[PDB]
């Protein structure tokens, strides 16, 4: 039965890092038949938060990597949080100890650096009396090797390792422990996770043999870097999915993009994770680092909000205001559509897109500085707005050819340029100095809107 696993530490957003491993061990889960497990890795209790943790679970929702088991669903191979499985930790441990395989090491109280012995008889005279008290396991002189899906054939030489500690003084395992023990008893047969993880895995390899366990099948995930190659950080720019969700970056777009890296796709670089689910494997993975690249990923978003359905564009966009805490006011729904039918053709993201979808949305936008400025400021721009003002409420028929009529007539009439024409009923109507197609957007704001801002804006200038 394939069972994979996201162990995150919930000691902060969920990287798209992050992201990335889930996602590969989704699909691989899905398209197998399997089950996709998620453990929270909290033992560090200093670091780790539910609020943490809360935050990786709604990043994973939102990405559409549903998990079959977990801190939240339960299943059978809980707890699902490490902090929640300190005694399972204690048994295994003590199993080892009694099959000579690990041991004690008690240690000095006043001075806790200082090493007194080690014994495989738990010391509880030393314990009832406070002194620390830690587990090392025992290293075999030996080869410790495995077969990576993506890193290819690894072999080690168990001697260039020291014991180690595998229990803590304060009753807390170490990652390496707790790891081995969970990845066992959930029964995950294959362990998908960043490559930062492949030096630790001899060591958990040293373990699962230790206690005669039979070791999943390992694959190491390059990295996703920054254009100078480290780990994408911080000052690579954004790095967490609840950033570029809140930036407008679509779901569907952000794990499309995941997915691409490195990836030298054959068809359509413009794709769903759902269309490619079928035909997933796990080797079409690059085995070297990719760089995340913001611009592209800005791209392969306006493909997809071009492409998409008008209504599922309309969908995604409420669903993101709302989130954003600027929800879309209430409007007629085929003029919903027709402004974002619009609207679209000229941004990248869904925050853009509610930047040029506002003056159409609502009537108290603001008008931009340089518009006052440069435009309404002139001289002419009082008569340029009364006349275009009478054109217009005089027009029987508001289709783009009178209404392209209209402008010409202004310019050519002699009450200012062309530009200054253009650029005065512009920003007169969104407020804006850069809008979709002038007359298509006069023509889906209607006879009485326009006419309604023209008014409005002859009032502002008045001041
Ligand atoms: N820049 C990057 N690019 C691409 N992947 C990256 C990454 N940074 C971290 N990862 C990978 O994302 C997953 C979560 O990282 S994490 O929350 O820190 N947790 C951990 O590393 C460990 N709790 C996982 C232990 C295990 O799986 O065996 C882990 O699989 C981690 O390896």
New binding site residues.
């Given amino acids: 039965l394939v069972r994979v696993?996201?162990?995150?530490?919930?000691?902060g957003h969920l990287?798209?890092?992050?992201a990335?491993?889930?996602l590969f061990n989704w699909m691989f889960a899905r398209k197998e038949g399997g089950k996709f497990i998620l453990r929270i890795?909290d033992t560090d209790t200093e670091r780790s938060s539910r609020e943490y943790e809360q935050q990786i679970l709604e990043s994973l929702r939102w990405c559409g990597l549903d998990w079959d088991e977990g801190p939240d669903i339960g299943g059978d191979f809980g707890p699902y949080r490490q902090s929640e499985r300190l005694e399972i930790y204690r048994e295994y441990a003590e199993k080892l100890v009694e099959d000579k395989r690990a041991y004690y090491v008690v240690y000095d109280k006043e001075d806790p650096s200082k090493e007194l012995f080690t014994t495989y008889e738990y010391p509880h005279e030393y314990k009832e009396k406070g002194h620390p008290v830690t587990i090392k396991f025992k290293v075999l002189p030996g080869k410790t090797s495995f077969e990576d899906l993506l890193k290819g054939y690894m072999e080690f030489d168990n001697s260039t390792l020291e014991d180690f500690i595998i229990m803590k003084s304060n009753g807390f395992p170490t990652?390496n422990f707790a790891?081995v023990v969970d990845?066992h008893l959930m029964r995950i047969s294959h362990?998908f996770?960043?490559?930062?993880?492949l030096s630790?895995t001899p060591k958990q390899l040293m373990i699962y043999e230790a206690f005669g366990w039979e070791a999943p099948v390992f694959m190491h995930?390059?990295?996703?870097?920054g254009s100078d190659r480290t780990?994408?950080s911080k000052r690579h720019g954004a790095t967490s999915v609840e950033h570029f969700r809140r930036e407008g970056i679509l779901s569907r777009a952000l794990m499309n993009y995941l997915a691409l890296l490195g990836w030298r796709v054959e068809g359509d670089e413009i794709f769903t994770i759902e269309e490619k689910l079928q035909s997933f494997d796990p080797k079409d993975i690059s085995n070297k680092g990719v760089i995340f690249d913001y611009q592209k990923l800005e791209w392969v978003n306006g493909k997809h909000m071009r492409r998409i359905d008008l209504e599922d564009l309309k969908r995604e966009f409420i669903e993101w205001a709302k989130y954003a805490g600027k929800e879309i006011p209430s409007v007629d729904e085929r003029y919903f559509s027709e402004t974002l039918r619009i609207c679209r053709e000229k941004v990248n993201t869904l925050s853009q897109l509610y930047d040029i979808m506002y003056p159409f949305m609502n009537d108290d936008y603001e008008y931009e500085k340089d518009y006052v400025e440069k435009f309404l400021k002139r001289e002419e721009a009082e008569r340029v707005l009364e006349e275009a003002k009478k054109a217009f409420k005089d027009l029987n028929s508001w289709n783009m050819e009178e209404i392209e009529k209209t402008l010409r007539d202004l310019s050519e009439k002699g009450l200012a340029s062309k530009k200054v024409v253009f650029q005065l009923i512009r920003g007169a109507v969104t407020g804006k100095l850069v809008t979709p197609g002038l007359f298509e957007t006069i023509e889906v704001l209607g006879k009485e809107r326009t006419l309604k801002r023209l008014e409005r804006t002859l009032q502002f200038l008045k001041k």
């Fill in positions: 696993r996201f162990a995150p530490s919930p000691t990287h798209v890092g992050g990335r491993t889930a890795e990652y790891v990845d362990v996770r960043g490559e930062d993880h630790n995930i390059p990295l996703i870097l780990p994408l």
